[PDB]
Design a binder for this molecule. Sequence first.
Ligand SMILES: *C/C=C1/C(=C/C2=NC(=C\c3[nH]c(/C=C4\NC(=O)C(C=C)=C4C)c(C)c3CCC(=O)O)/C(CCC(=O)O)=C2C)NC(=O)C1C
Ligand SMILES: *C/C=C1/C(=C/C2=NC(=C\c3[nH]c(/C=C4\NC(=O)C(C=C)=C4C)c(C)c3CCC(=O)O)/C(CCC(=O)O)=C2C)NC(=O)C1C
Lengths: 490, 490
Amino acid sequence: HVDLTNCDREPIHIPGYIQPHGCLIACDNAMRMVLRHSENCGELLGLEGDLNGRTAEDVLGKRLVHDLRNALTTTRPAMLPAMETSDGRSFDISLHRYKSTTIIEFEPSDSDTQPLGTARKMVDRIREADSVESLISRTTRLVKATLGYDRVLIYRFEEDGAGKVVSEAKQPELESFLGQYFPASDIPQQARALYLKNTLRIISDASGTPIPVLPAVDVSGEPLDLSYAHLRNFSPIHCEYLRNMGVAASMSISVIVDDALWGLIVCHHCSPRVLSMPVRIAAAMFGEFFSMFLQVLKQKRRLDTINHAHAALDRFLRLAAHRANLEELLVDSFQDFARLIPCDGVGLWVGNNWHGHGATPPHDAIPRLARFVASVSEGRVWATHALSQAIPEAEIYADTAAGMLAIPISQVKSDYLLFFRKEIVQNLNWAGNPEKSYETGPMGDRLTPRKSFAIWKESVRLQAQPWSEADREIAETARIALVGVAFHHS
Amino acid sequence: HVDLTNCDREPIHIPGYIQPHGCLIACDNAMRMVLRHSENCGELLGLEGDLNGRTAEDVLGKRLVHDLRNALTTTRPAMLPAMETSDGRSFDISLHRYKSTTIIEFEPSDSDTQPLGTARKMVDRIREADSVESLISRTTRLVKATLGYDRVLIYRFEEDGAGKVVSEAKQPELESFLGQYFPASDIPQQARALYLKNTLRIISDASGTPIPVLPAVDVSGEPLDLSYAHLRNFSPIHCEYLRNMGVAASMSISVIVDDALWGLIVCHHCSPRVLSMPVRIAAAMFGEFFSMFLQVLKQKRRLDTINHAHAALDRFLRLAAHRANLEELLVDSFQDFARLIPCDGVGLWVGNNWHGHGATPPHDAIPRLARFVASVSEGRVWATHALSQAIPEAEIYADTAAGMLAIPISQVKSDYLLFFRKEIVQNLNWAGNPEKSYETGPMGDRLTPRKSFAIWKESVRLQAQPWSEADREIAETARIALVGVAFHHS
Ligand SMILES: *C/C=C1/C(=C/C2=NC(=C\c3[nH]c(/C=C4\NC(=O)C(C=C)=C4C)c(C)c3CCC(=O)O)/C(CCC(=O)O)=C2C)NC(=O)C1C
Ligand SMILES: *C/C=C1/C(=C/C2=NC(=C\c3[nH]c(/C=C4\NC(=O)C(C=C)=C4C)c(C)c3CCC(=O)O)/C(CCC(=O)O)=C2C)NC(=O)C1C
């Protein structure tokens, strides 16, 4: 049994079933003996009776088995498009070895597509992108046009595991998910772990009858680990989700940046759809190249951001020299620091006087905040995205200021520069349709995009967009700049 | 007993003695009762008999004890220059609370120096430094001229804990330590931990008679933790070291960068020397400001380095477009990649052909390296500073190439770009005098700069300067640039 109470702990790596668009044979470490096989090995390979106990050379043939052994020579599956069996039948074969068990996946052959050629055309069109936004927007559009899926999304993972739809290409009749968030629980930890091990992940048919593996558990009480198997069957929880959405097929591409799961390129189809091995090889290479280019562009953006901050602080220090009263200069210019760190408001607390700009807490609320900041600051940068978790009184003005970053501007006195952010739900640019409802199944209305979005909204209430490492790094450079020049003027 | 066999595990935080230039009183959490006191409390404060058991108000006076209580209101010692006792005697007082024990340190008062004024003059002269090198070189010279110590050094800690003398200002007659390294064991872990907790550390007299604390251990079997006490006595191992060097006094300033111990500003004097509390306050503030400015300058240098790499790779990709044969371009231009990553040599391994530039392994040795690199690389950047630890055959050419960083330039073929570094002892710029020998003590010749340097040299044999995070980050950006354009040309 699997339900909404235990689906976060579901062992999705050992389902004991495969998808019907191919058949599976498991063999021993040295591919001599057949240990397990899929029920549908009978139909596709055209063999009689049980395969378990019989040798690899007996069941496949000496000719083929020799080539498979040679291909094994670390955990990445070997692709063998268009191999011939004994009778002559052509099959595309995926061969890998994990937990000293050799797995062999067969699907009907397709020799009418060139992987390198398809991939090169796609990678050329993204190679010359000069911004993250430009790469992201063009990629959904490009992948849709090339692989002909009804909908292509890019999800980006937030710090808290939540996913944001940052790009979309779809059929006009389908509803938009652009700007929508899903909760971390919508992709369990064991799913993120598999997504990090396999570039590609295919679901040919959400309504397809799953084929069992024989045996499901062997003599020593072990299940067959299908972590690296492309035929591994999908969770019935995700199955019902796709069925509820009207999605029949899917193919996800993992986006890996600084050896972390940045997000997914995900393709939905409203009818069943299996890509042939050669097309899957091209899509995988594209995914690998998309990941590398995004990594460099993220690196370039970080450098430009912090370079612009250094330039701005130099401009200010040049002014600070020619001007006699530094307090006077800060009062005139504090709003200009909003250019350094993304914020919805910024304020100056100097000589027990408050000056606000943009969305700040109310004038009467500032003294409490100032005294609190002085308490916990200890002459260093202090920052929260959940202001009411620190000061329960702050809940009342969360719609204006739910997040705060404090910069000390004096080594001696308790003067601060306060950056503010509105609660994250305020700044939403959701392009979806609230009138669109979804058909539910046995499990309930939890497995609908509508309910996923409502659960996320509840989780991030009274909270702002978290302060990034780049935000922190700029705040620290501004502290040293202001504390420094404040010391000089005394 | 303490000797060279257990001095790495020495509990230097609980010595049970203090330096004679002040007296110590320990009291209970709420400074009511006197729990411990230094033997010399009798002489300096002019009091009769045992102090333990007597109240704080009885021994110091209601007037003074009130001001001490008020000053406590987290672990940083409170400075109280020129406080009066009962009879009128003037004392400079350092007050702190650690492990729910209040410690009170007394030294004869000095009210003929302004902390802020001294510190401001010093901090002005370093504020406008535009390079790490410029800040480092001027600071030794400046600190010497201001605090009048015979020698000022800056040690910078390497990745392996070793220390390098990166700057020096000294009397002409003294021997130079500039460019010399010391081993990690020369500053134990518990010493680095204390150096990270206290900005300043003073030794008034290496030949001074240490004053015992009474009792050394109390009723419950606890020693007095003097971690934050400026009067805490020094290890006899370090004592003998300074005596062997001809050093009588020392004062070290901790350099803290990204919340790590970057190194020390260290001042040696050949005669005894105690700085008054006001001068120590100025030196501490200077240390704090020196640390902040070095942090920003390190950040600026990292940005400039990686910016210059991006510019260089853009120049190359612009050339790669106009040129038809990419292999031909790489053969002509590979030496130019030496500008990206600091190296003593660079080579190109393309189509099983080798092209070398600078200090590379011999021509006959390259095929072995190439096959090895292909083995462990797995299409990612691979780097070592100890090449012979990976390939014992490589020991023979360590003087030319002891370190290697490999960059794959093809997704498909096993082509690499190899950066090399000579073994670290080759590239030494040691400004010391090998004729200068040192007087040893009971412990042996281990406690001499000569033997410290010889031990370090032995530890880094057959090893190169480690590849930095910045070196790695540039190598990764170059991989994506070369793998990318290599794909386009097919
Ligand atoms: C309690 C367990 C649940 C669960 C498990 C589960 N989710 C998996 C994949 C997956 N889930 C989502 C969520 C969404 N996809 C969308 O397109 C939208 C909205 C438009 C949502 C909210 C996504 C995106 C994915 C990735 C695949 C895809 O997007 O098509 C898996 C994968 C397991 C496997 O590899 O077999 C598991 C398991 N999902 C739940 O919602 C819940 C509650
Ligand atoms: C086995 C234990 C040893 C040891 C312990 C120890 N060292 C400490 C401080 C310290 N040691 C050095 C080493 C040098 N200083 C130099 O100037 C030179 C060469 C020119 C060397 C090699 C240094 C620099 C320092 C810091 C202070 C200073 O430089 O003056 C301490 C401090 C403990 C305390 O806080 O009381 C301990 C303990 N030192 C050894 O050499 C060895 C073997």
